[model samples]
Target: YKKEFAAYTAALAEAESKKKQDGYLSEPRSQSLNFKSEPNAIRTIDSSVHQYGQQELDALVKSWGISPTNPDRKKSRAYSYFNAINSNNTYAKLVLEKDKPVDVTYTGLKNSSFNGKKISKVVYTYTLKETGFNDGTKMTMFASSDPTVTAWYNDYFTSTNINVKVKFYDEEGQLMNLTGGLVNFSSLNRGNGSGAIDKDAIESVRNFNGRYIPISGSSIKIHENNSAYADSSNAEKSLGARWNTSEWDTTSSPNNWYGAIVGEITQSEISFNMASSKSGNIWFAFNSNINAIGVPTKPVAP
Candidate 1:
């Protein structure tokens, strides 16, 4: 009916119950955050095709720009996007340097050229960050007729803050200008699908606005003992000083609470979207990345 966070948690608990068969919701029914977190600035959980435009065909060679043959570089590049989002500019600059922690960078293939060939462009996508991520390193892009290149350093900061630089024949400078060809990455994508259940909030309260909304199940209300602040008819304060944070699970179906806010990544991310495309009716949604296997798992350095 009206699904809420508590309801989902209860359902998950019921499912986990069957999986464990030990009847221990106490084990903490495996939920997680980091929908916006990164293992490192340049790594991610997976790269799904969210959307694309200007599709074309070209024979672009997609060699693994960051050599895998070199064992040290391989290990350094194995990180997540969220990692970069969280780092400030100074830290990111250092990591992106030739040799540093979170060693990832983006270098356009110069020996390679658009080569008088039609520009074949495709935007690869990713979500949050996490451990045991097969998608980040596993995914790559290339021209339709070529092998895709592996992840590079700047790819990490794509989820965070980054300025791409490239070499181009400048008309104004009258010389070779090192300027990036512009890889404009849009913000994370959201969905419009409604899940199977619409659970009622486990705990609900009406605010001054008059909309009855749901919230967490466990709570503690404190009572005021001061006569000046207390209504003699009331028991000083109703609730107590501290309250429990635990709640129900998903399988419970009819639930007591649903989250009002959904987020994708961990590490305090400010939500934003690409303003490039304007004027459209869009539905918004948010959720936590249970395993941190989403794009932008981390923030870019300032």
Candidate 2:
């Protein structure tokens, strides 16, 4: 399971596929992906469509292609996919339904168990149809094993070059608590497009750590006359990843950032219109980075 700070939770939730009918498209290999809501939020009198500009609005398109037959000018973040994103929904997902709580889940409480305030055990499993945002691809997986997120990843799994980011939010809509928390990203192995995990499709937890470089005049320094510390390199290890603290900042977020490797894979290659039978307990949100064509199909590691 991967853990992160709590503040960015709300934005993460909004990125969930539950309500939105996304267009996970592609071009050659890399292209812009636009995720639009089906039944857009209510429209205001003065805010017909022209009022919406550079805002997080929803757009319904007959074709979810970069070169769509008829692209709606009313979509929010339509232009965002043209750029990049991060593990957290960080400063994106441009607001499809502002007033509506986009980041939300209903994780059932059957075989699940809470770990000392930590989240564990998803409920069921499912999949989504092949997507076209990039090239029709499958995004699928099962919910949880026993109770903890690790239970499902006990066997051979497929590791597609796909990038899936799972974000969790709190009651007030925060990604995680300041104290920090874990979010797991695996295939939801229970649905029409479901499939077995490929052997090489997994990574072990990372041993590398993020630390803080000692500030020259740090008050906590035991320097000079304290000759014992005279030649001190004067560096320190901070919580989580010190340098990573602001790494997700909008100004420059981290991409392909290899954090803790997911201990294992539960499932992959989602099914079409398959609502996850599991998840939802602690606002567990999921997203992918590859073009829609990249999923279901084996991954070509970058």
Candidate 3:
């Protein structure tokens, strides 16, 4: 009878321990998804669409109180339901609205000849409209070609080949503080004097900025310095590559090339010096599409 009683007590203790283990397993997790409510804060969806990849989209839906199993279906259902409600309701119509066009205008800022060579400067302004956080923002870009490069010997190059400087202003025309940014150049050639950018010739006066950093066989990236800002987290963000044409063969020369600069309006102005030594037909030009990305700022009320 003593042995039987001891066995019974042991079984009871085992059952109690199992019950406690089950309770622990069922307990709710303390860590939850942190969501940002600020207008200028980067959202998970934006990160997934712009910075990250499709895998991040899956993680995003899971954070929205959805089952992790079969995340693709959950994501589609969430978007479909949101779209359906937004389309049917008048007040919710703006929920899924598309981004408005950012009007861009270019102006000839300066043109002059120096030391028997010609230099030209053009300013392009990107005016944002209806972007909730950045509405009415104006990003000004000044591009100036090097005066030392006399001219393009062949049709492949032009007087427009330029280095860039950028600035940003809010709707009230007040300058905004920035951290850092990036610039991309494409259609670059590989060999010497082949009508492509000479990587070795690229230089930046400011050691903080990275210049002539090659991204591909023909593309390069120039990143701005962000040491002045209290928060420099956004400095590493990529502006995404824009390769408009097929990569030119390293052996063969391409007539037309493209480039773009993207960076935060950190200082009053930031400049990129991508010019290499002058050669026969290789020069920079503004003919390529230009794009810029600025750090999001709070929208000023009109």
Best-fitting candidate, scored by TM-score: 3
Tens-digit lDDT track for model 1 on 135-242? 333222111111022222223211122121212222232223111111111111111111111111011110111111111221211122200111111111222212
Candidate 2 ranges with C-alpha deviation above 4 Å: 1-104, 107-136, 145-147, 150-159, 171-175, 178-302
- What's model 1's overall lDDT? 0.20
Error of 1 at 239 (Å): 60
Candidate with better TM-score, 1 vs 2: 2
lDDT of 2 by residue, 6-25 (tens): 32333234323322222111
Q: Quote model 3's TM-score.
A: 0.25
Each prediction's TM-score against the native?
0.17, 0.20, 0.25
Per-residue C-alpha lDDT of model 3 across residues 1-302, encoded as one tens digit per residue: 45644654564455344432311211111111111111221111122122222334335434443323424553334333323222322110111112222121122213321112222222222111221111212111111222111112111111112233433333344443333222223223322222232212221112223322221121333335421110111111222223222332221223122222222223444443322221222333322111211112122222
The 10 consecutive residues of candidate 3 with the worst lDDT sum are 27-36
Q: Residue 69 CA error for candidate 3 (Å)?
A: 76
Enumerate clash totals for all models, in the order shown: 80, 51, 4
Off by over 4 Å in 1: 19-302
